[PDB]
Design a protein around this ligand. Structure first.
Ligand SMILES: O=C(COc1ccc(Cl)cc1)N[C@H]1CC[C@H](NC(=O)COc2ccc(Cl)cc2)CC1
Lengths: 426, 410, 240, 275, 318
């Protein structure tokens, strides 16, 4: 049997504002590569034969981004199916359009458009297939989690997930989040339903690559109130007397899998991709065929593109990526940051955990720490930036104007904190 | 065996020539999976078995069980189709959505206590509407059943203050209840001269796995006939049809016409089919177009029914304050139907068509619900509105359709 | 001396042999030249004369009151205990050698060490030794509650539901000092377990450990486990 | 118990034979001729390759079968000079196919002699000369003629009736030939998704199925089965699978044309492949 | 056309993602098969056009995986075969193509018998009651030891690898033959080097100056063998020999995911730490005493001549 997959390339949460107001969150570059290309490379490394990309907001931009990619070529082993409609605005709507179109056949994969992973789940696929073969289509969904620590900077407090599963046949009994909860309550029927073994797990990072039967599309057509994945699981776990449909679980301890939801997950997944945690998906490996992203890997995870023309006194000590055509001046100090292609950096500048995209221009004497600079940006001289400062789509920051810690600037007034110009004062 | 034929001009509801589906009878009480046992004890355990499949919508669909109540080598005159629905709220929303639905309500009450399930059943029976009270707590003591009958007589006095005048307190009691239902429940007036509208509730596939190339039966759908008479050979008219969104925009609903090859009920039915029962029609449709519970919610018309496929219906928002007879001992803001918020899913039950729709806009008496699937019932019919309270779809209000956005492709 | 073994008597020798002899044999087989055994007075205050008719090396029998619990008997022998307390009971048929629970008490410097065997939900750490939660389904209004600190310090907690309490404890001196300082405790199996399990969720703290045996099981006060006492003693007391 | 493969005990000049290397010396590689009753030959060190060769063991692979052309033969002296340099890959494939057919004929006659319990090698050689070498001398083709006569006798046993060996030996040889060289069995299975979302959908589906079943040739019935609601399995259990796959493709094309004539889609879920 | 391009793209993606296949001999055989499938289904008039086509395809094949140099030096050996055939036929369309085809055929016959020649010459390098030290896992040194143990009795110390223990399967495969295998960690190498008689290892890539990249931890082992003056044996075939100089080109070591070194369940300290995992290590030629290939034994001061017998200096850039 073939291996189908659906890819929700439109995250329906209003989190990347006003970053997603210009280009969507699945087209942002981690290290000069959009997350669509990362997820599609993960899908071809898995071994799928055909995918179904679903995109609603700015879907023409996603379409023109991925038609010129490696996966739309006729020599690609994994074909794609671009499906465009502005009617759906939820993952359950995507799955009920899948059920209405009858695209999938048996044991299809479910992934978001912003999932970074390198897990081979053929073992979990065979486990799901044997669990469907013995119990006669009782197991419907196999969620996938990664072994992680609760104090890790990858999983934040907004996306921490605590489950309660079985120990010997790993079926999920309870599943919830910690969104503003200091004390957790678990039901009592999970012990009466299974007197053989039960374990509460908080060490599980969610990667949202939960493979599933085509019966979840049927259950989404029946229950219209199920909006997304987590309330669907929370409703299936409490409705066990009718339509039981036990959800099983797989854990990964040697492979990486995560997604993005805000600037914190973006920063953590970018720092993990730069530190080669998602190997083989590596920036110098060039998994997509493009000449503008070919790179070389020196010591201390220093990634250097072509035609950089590095200056005297510049220090690159740890976890530095430089795009193609990035102009770097003298006496710089860059660490734990990614720089886009075609940038211009001044003199006596520091870069601490920043994320600079293509087309930016940083003048001399600028102090940038833990920021995010989007496309075609401009930064003047004598400026000091604070952590968690976002500027999107060619925001110019005037001279002698420091920004606070919480400060997001864009061209849209009510979505961002303010709008900038050649002078930062209004 | 029956002796029906295809020679009929104007049949009646109490016609003994058909003897398949004469009248329908609703059943809503305090059963908690106890009404199916009463329907098996009244009609038969394995009597209703025509085409089984996987249970897709258990709490949303209602099952019809035929009963040929005979009298005196007995003689049968009229048959009763008992309609058992999982959850009384779905049966109440199906009854309070128009006409010719749940003509004979059967109140299956318990002679054990006076809990709130019977109060919610009485509230649903008052919101639906001829009631038929029946005690199922058999094999009790004499004085205990006397005190339970006194408590049920007080509950029936409150019922008779609303609508409450049946009187019935294991096989002998079932036979007495069947005789009382045959002697008390009159024949309801049904329109047989109108066009046949078969609202599908449960579709099945008659083709087995690995069948022959010539012996291939496809599109054996099943539902309920609202009005009219359906004969074999008549070209059916699926009002919803195939809804395809391949044009990258508004979905087009192409009506698929299929000639009705046979009308296969639970028994060996004839060519003519009347209303008031689970009518199963095997037409000349494809197996992929009519899969297991895929063609549900489609009005299978006969003469080109006027109801067009509506995508957005602006109706009159009229929600109740509290739940109909649902109030526990705590009642800590549990029976409190909230207002129609934006982007909220609601189960609009237009007759037998239970479709989900999101509340796109609402202005103070008018709510424009955008339905997920295309519905085609009428332009001003009484449409209900439900909401899942706690893992159960419960009714929240009713209204009348003021406007709609229609679409009809070809 | 490291331990002072105390055998509790709450409402006894009804079986194929004396029910108090098997804990006394389990104590006198390995060490325990000083054994303290309390007497029962709720059912009948005459079991001391029957317990003093045995043939053990050294038994210390004391009279007790009728209306008393386990914590009252811990507080009753407070001026005559100078070391760690190792609590027993009458209905304790244990074919498991108890050296391993003393190893769990000594090696991790635990304040409490108990033994369970295959009502009460016991959540233990993933190593299988240090308990983190325990609760009965009777005195709980909700189903269960779990703090965030015990999930942050211990991200996986394995829960068991088919466990019984063998009433084999190992107490520290400051625990019974707190028990003498707090006289509101009556049942030690419901007080010293739950209050210490709550106080362990504080660095510098206390350690509670438990072993889950898989060889045999204990008995009960009622007649539900009285049929398995003779069938368990006819095949396991031959090697003892 | 062994014999040679052909009526000649020694190969001719420039005749490519199949050998296996047995030992390595300084003068060359001692081999055994598998189709001439394991007589000893020698592949020369100068003839092992067209390139300067440092060691004989770099391309010898003692234990591996190889095709070598005969350069010099001496029946009196017992010297057989072989060469791996002269042989072409086309001649090597021809010698491999000829050795495979001759080994199949040798195994068939060895099974026939084991059924006849002829323990003597001279009686077994007489069975060889009466069964295979007579056809090889009649058709003037060693290896090809005997295998062609046995493939014709597996279908029409009139060629085996001309052998005057014995009454039971001819029947045992015919049974061994029909059990060894007559495995004519194949199953070309294919999946096709033909449907019609129109007025007479099931009627057009049944008409396309009848048109596909009517195109089934003789001794090759294309059996159609409903594996799914939208998918169908068109199997064909017949010999000559190179023609059976073409017949299944023609039936699938006829079914697709009959589906497209009645306004219905017809996708190919699986091509014609052997089971 | 289509089949060739999809096989080339699948080969590039298989070299890009992981180790496909497992053994290097099957990878060399499928590289020969890909090259012969390319040259039998293409058209050329001059040999320089075929040279530039094989150069353009080999640039992509080394850009797919720069650590896997087997495809690179195999493409270079095929290019020198093209150069020798054009030189011997210049001083030519079907005869030249048949000569290249039979040269690739006899190269495959040579490639199939490397391990049996190494096992055949294993008898003149192992004596009885010997202490053998081996790092990592390779089938060449395993066949070496399992053929030398057919007539001799000795002891092998199989040291595991610290990122991923690949020596455990080699230890349980050698102990089935009964060679008294001793297993230890990587930190005891000098702590066992006072008793090791001879070190016999394999490698991943033989460099041009006699140096070698191999599995990590063997540069330390070669330093300890030079300190204790024990001879070093490299059981390596003739397709792991490459002209790529160590300090010339970048991307020498293959860096892999740090989950095998430091797991993801470590805690909050994974943000303020920098974990590297180089799976390969560089060994200079002065710490090597003897190379063992199918043609026999060679000094590390002789590998250049093998270059002059297998590679052209004009093809070193590819
Ligand atoms: O038993 C072993 C196992 O070796 C190890 C296994 C594991 C580890 Cl961690 C370390 C060493 N090695 C033997 C090998 C023969 C040797 N020598 C002899 O037995 C005889 O000694 C002589 C005698 C004469 C001469 Cl010329 C040389 C050595 C002793 C040690």
């Amino acid at each position: 049997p073939p291996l189908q997959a659906v890819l929700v390339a439109d995250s329906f949460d209003r989190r990347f504002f006003p970053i997603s107001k210009d280009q969507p969150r699945v087209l942002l570059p981690l290290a000069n590569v959009a997350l669509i290309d990362y997820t599609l490379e993960f899908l071809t490394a898995t071994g799928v034969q055909e995918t179904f990309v679903f995109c609603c907001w700015k879907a023409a931009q996603i379409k023109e981004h991925l038609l010129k990619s490696k996966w739309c070529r006729p020599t690609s082993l994994n074909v794609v199916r671009i499906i465009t409609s502005e009617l759906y605005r939820s993952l359950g709507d995507v799955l009920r359009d899948v059920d209405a179109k009858a695209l999938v056949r048996s044991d299809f994969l479910l992934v978001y458009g912003d999932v970074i992973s390198n897990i081979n789940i053929t073992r979990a696929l065979e486990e799901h297939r044997l669990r469907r073969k013995l119990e006669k289509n009782v197991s419907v969904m196999t969620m996938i989690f990664k072994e992680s620590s609760p104090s890790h900077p990858t999983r934040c407090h907004e996306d921490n997930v605590v489950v309660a599963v079985d120990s010997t046949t790993n079926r999920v009994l309870h599943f919830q989040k910690t969104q503003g909860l200091r004390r957790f309550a678990f039901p009592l029927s999970l012990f009466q339903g299974s007197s053989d073994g039960v374990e509460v797990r908080y060490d599980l990072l969610d990667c949202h690559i939960s493979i599933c039967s085509p019966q979840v599309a049927q259950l989404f057509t029946d229950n219209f109130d199920y909006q997304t994945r987590d309330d669907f699981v929370r409703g299936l776990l409490v409705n066990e007397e009718i339509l039981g449909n036990q959800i099983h679980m797989h854990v990964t301890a040697k492979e990486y899998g995560a997604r993005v939801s805000n600037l914190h997950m973006y920063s953590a997944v970018c720092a993990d991709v730069i530190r080669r945690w998602v190997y083989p998906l590596t920036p110098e490996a060039n998994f997509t065929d493009s000449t503008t992203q070919s790179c070389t890997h020196s010591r201390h995870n220093i990634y250097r593109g072509p035609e950089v023309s590095l200056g005297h006194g510049s220090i690159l000590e740890e976890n530095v990526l430089l795009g193609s055509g990035t102009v770097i001046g003298s006496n710089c100090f860059i660490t734990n940051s990614v720089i886009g292609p075609g940038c211009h950096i001044g003199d006596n500048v520091v870069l601490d955990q920043t994320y600079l995209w293509q087309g930016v221009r940083v003048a001399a004497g600028a102090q940038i720490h833990q920021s995010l600079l989007c496309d075609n940006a401009e930064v003047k001289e004598r400026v000091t930036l604070k952590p968690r400062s976002v500027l999107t789509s060619q925001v110019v920051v005037g001279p002698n104007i420091t920004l606070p810690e919480g400060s997001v600037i864009s061209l849209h007034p009510p979505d961002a904190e303010e709008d900038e110009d050649d002078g930062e004062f209004s | 065996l029956t002796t029906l034929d295809v020679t009929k001009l104007t049949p009646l509801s109490h016609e003994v020539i058909s003897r398949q589906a004469t009248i329908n009878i609703g059943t809503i009480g305090h059963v908690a999976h106890g009404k199916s046992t009463v329907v098996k004890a009244i009609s038969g355990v394995h009597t209703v078995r025509f085409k089984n499949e996987l249970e897709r919508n258990i709490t949303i669909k209602l099952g019809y069980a035929n009963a040929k109540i005979y009298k005196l080598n007995f003689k049968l005159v009229r048959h009763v189709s008992f309609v058992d629905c999982p959850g009384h709220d779905i049966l109440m929303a199906t009854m309070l959505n128009g006409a010719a639905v749940m003509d004979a309500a059967l109140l299956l009450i318990a002679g054990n206590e006076s809990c709130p399930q019977p109060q919610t059943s009485e509230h649903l029976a008052a919101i639906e509407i001829h009631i038929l009270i029946l005690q199922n707590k058999i094999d009790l003591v004499k004085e205990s059943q006397a005190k339970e009958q006194y408590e049920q007589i007080l509950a029936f006095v409150q019922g008779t203050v609303a609508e409450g005048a049946p009187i019935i307190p294991l096989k002998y009691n079932i036979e007495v209840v069947c005789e009382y239902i045959v002697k008390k429940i009159p024949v309801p007036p049904r329109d047989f001269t109108s066009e046949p509208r078969l609202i599908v509730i449960r579709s099945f596939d008659v083709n087995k796995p690995g069948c022959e190339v010539d012996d291939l039966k496809g599109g054996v759908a099943g539902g309920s006939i609202l009005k009219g008479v359906l004969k074999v050979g008549q070209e059916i008219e699926v009002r919803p049809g195939i809804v395809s969104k391949a044009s990258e925009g508004k979905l087009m609903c192409k009506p698929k016409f299929s000639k009705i090859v046979s009308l296969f009920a639970e028994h060996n039915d004839l060519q003519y089919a009347a209303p008031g029962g689970l009518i199963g029609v095997g037409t000349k449709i494809d197996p992929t177009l009519c899969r297991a519970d895929r063609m549900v919610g489609q009005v299978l018309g006969a003469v080109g029914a006027l109801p067009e496929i509506f995508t957005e219906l602006e109706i009159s928002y009229f929600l109740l304050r509290r739940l109909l007879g649902v109030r526990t001992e705590g009642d800590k803001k549990a029976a409190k139907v909230q207002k129609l918020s934006k982007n909220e899913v609601l189960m609009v039950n237009i007759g037998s068509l239970s479709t989900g729709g999101r509340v796109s806009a609402v202005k103070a008496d008018l709510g424009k619900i955008v339905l997920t699937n295309p519905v085609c019932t009428e332009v001003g019919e009484k449409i209900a509105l439900s909401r899942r309270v706690e893992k159960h779809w419960r009714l929240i209000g009713w209204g009348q359709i003021r406007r709609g956005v229609t679409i009809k492709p070809t | 001396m490291e331990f002072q073994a105390v055998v509790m008597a709450v409402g006894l020798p009804v079986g194929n042999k004396p029910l108090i002899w098997y804990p006394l044999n389990l104590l006198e087989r390995v060490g325990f030249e000083e054994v303290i055994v309390v007497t029962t007075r709720d059912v009948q205050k005459a079991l001391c004369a029957e317990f003093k008719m045995k043939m053990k090396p050294d038994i210390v029998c004391i009279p007790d009151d009728a209306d008393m619990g386990t914590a009252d008997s811990l507080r009753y022998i407070y001026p005559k205990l100078k070391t760690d307390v190792l609590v027993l009971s009458c209905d304790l048929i244990t074919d498991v050698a108890l050296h391993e629970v003393v190893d769990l008490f000594r090696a991790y410097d635990a304040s409490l060490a108990m033994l369970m065997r295959k009502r009460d939900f016991i959540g233990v750490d993933s190593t299988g030794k240090r308990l983190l939660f325990m609760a009965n389904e009777a005195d709980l209004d909700e189903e269960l509650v779990i703090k965030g600190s015990i999930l942050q310090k211990h991200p996986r907690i394995r829960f068991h539901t088919g466990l019984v309490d063998a009433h084999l404890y190992c107490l520290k001196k400051y625990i019974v000092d707190f028990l003498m300082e707090n006289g509101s405790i009556t049942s030690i199996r419901s007080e010293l377990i739950p209050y210490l399990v709550r106080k362990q969720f504080s660095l510098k703290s206390l350690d509670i450990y438990s072993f889950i045996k898989e060889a045999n099981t204990l008995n009960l006060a009622p007649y539900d486990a009285c049929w398995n006492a003779c069938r368990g003693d006819r095949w396991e007391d031959l090697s003892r | 118990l062994s014999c040679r493969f052909y009526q000649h005990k020694f190969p001719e000049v420039e005749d490519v034979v199949m050998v296996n290397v047995r030992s390595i010396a300084e003068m060359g590689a001692y081999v055994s001729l598998l189709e001439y009753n394991n007589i000893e030959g020698m592949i020369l060190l100068s003839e092992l390759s067209r390139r300067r060769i440092r060691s004989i063991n770099k391309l010898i692979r003692i234990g591996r079968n190889e095709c070598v052309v005969v350069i010099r033969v001496d029946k009196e002296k017992g010297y057989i000079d072989l060469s791996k340099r002269r042989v072409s890959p086309e001649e090597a494939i021809k010698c491999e196919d000829k050795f495979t057919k001759s080994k199949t004929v040798y195994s068939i006659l060895r099974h026939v002699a084991e059924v006849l319990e002829y323990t003597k090698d001279e009686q077994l050689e007489s069975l060889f000369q009466r069964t295979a070498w007579v056809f090889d001398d009649k058709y003037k083709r060693p290896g090809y003629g005997a295998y062609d006569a046995f493939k014709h006798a597996v279908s029409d046993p009139s060629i085996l009736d001309s052998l005057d060996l014995n009454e039971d030996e001819r029947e045992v040889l015919i049974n061994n030939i029909n059990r060894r060289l007559t495995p004519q069995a194949v199953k070309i299975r294919a999946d096709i998704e033909v449907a019609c979302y129109g007025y007479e959908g099931i009627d057009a589906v049944k008409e396309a199925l009848r048109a596909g079943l009517n195109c089934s040739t003789e001794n090759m019935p294309i059996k159609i089965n409903l594996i799914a609601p939208p998918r169908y399995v068109m199997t064909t259990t017949t010999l000559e699978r190179t023609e059976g796959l073409s017949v299944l493709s023609q039936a699938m094309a006829v079914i697709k044309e009959k589906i497209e004539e009645k306004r219905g889609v017809f996708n190919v879920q699986m091509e014609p492949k052997v089971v | 056309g289509s089949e060739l391009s999809e096989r080339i793209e699948s080969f590039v993606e298989t070299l890009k993602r992981g180790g496909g296949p497992r053994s290097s001999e099957e990878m060399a055989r499928e590289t020969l098969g890909l090259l012969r499938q390319i040259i039998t289904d293409h058209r050329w008039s001059n040999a320089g056009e075929l040279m530039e086509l094989i150069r353009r395809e080999g640039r992509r094949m080394t850009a797919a995986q720069p650590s896997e140099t087997t495809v690179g030096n195999m493409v270079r050996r095929v290019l020198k075969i093209i150069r020798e055939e054009y030189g011997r036929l210049h001083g030519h369309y079907a005869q030249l193509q048949s000569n290249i085809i039979e040269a690739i055929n006899e190269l495959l016959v040579e490639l199939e018998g490397t391990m049996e020649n190494i096992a055949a010459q294993a008898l003149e390098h192992i004596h009885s009651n010997e202490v053998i030290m081996t790092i990592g896992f390779s089938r060449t040194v395993e066949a070496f030891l399992k053929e030398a143990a057919r007539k001799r009795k000795f002891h092998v110390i199989v040291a595991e690898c610290a990122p991923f223990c690949q020596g455990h399967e080699m230890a349980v495969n050698l102990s089935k033959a009964g060679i008294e295998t001793t297993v230890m960690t990587d930190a005891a190498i000098f702590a066992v080097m006072s008793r090791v008689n001879k070190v016999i290892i394999g490698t991943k890539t033989i460099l041009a100056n006699g140096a070698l990249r191999a599995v990590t931890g063997t540069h330390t082992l070669a330093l300890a063998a030079k300190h204790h003056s024990t001879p070093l044996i490299v059981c390596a075939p003739m397709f792991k020999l490459s002209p790529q100089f160590p300090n010339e080109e970048d991307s020498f070591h293959k860096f892999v995911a740090p989950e095998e070194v430091l797991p993801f369940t470590e805690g909050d300290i994974l943000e303020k730490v920098s974990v590297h995992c180089p799976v390969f290590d560089y060994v200079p030629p002065e710490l090597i005493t003897l190379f063992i290939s199918n043609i026999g034994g060679n000094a590390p001061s002789y590998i250049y001549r093998l270059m002059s017998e297998l590679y052209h200096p004009d093809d070193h850039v590819l």
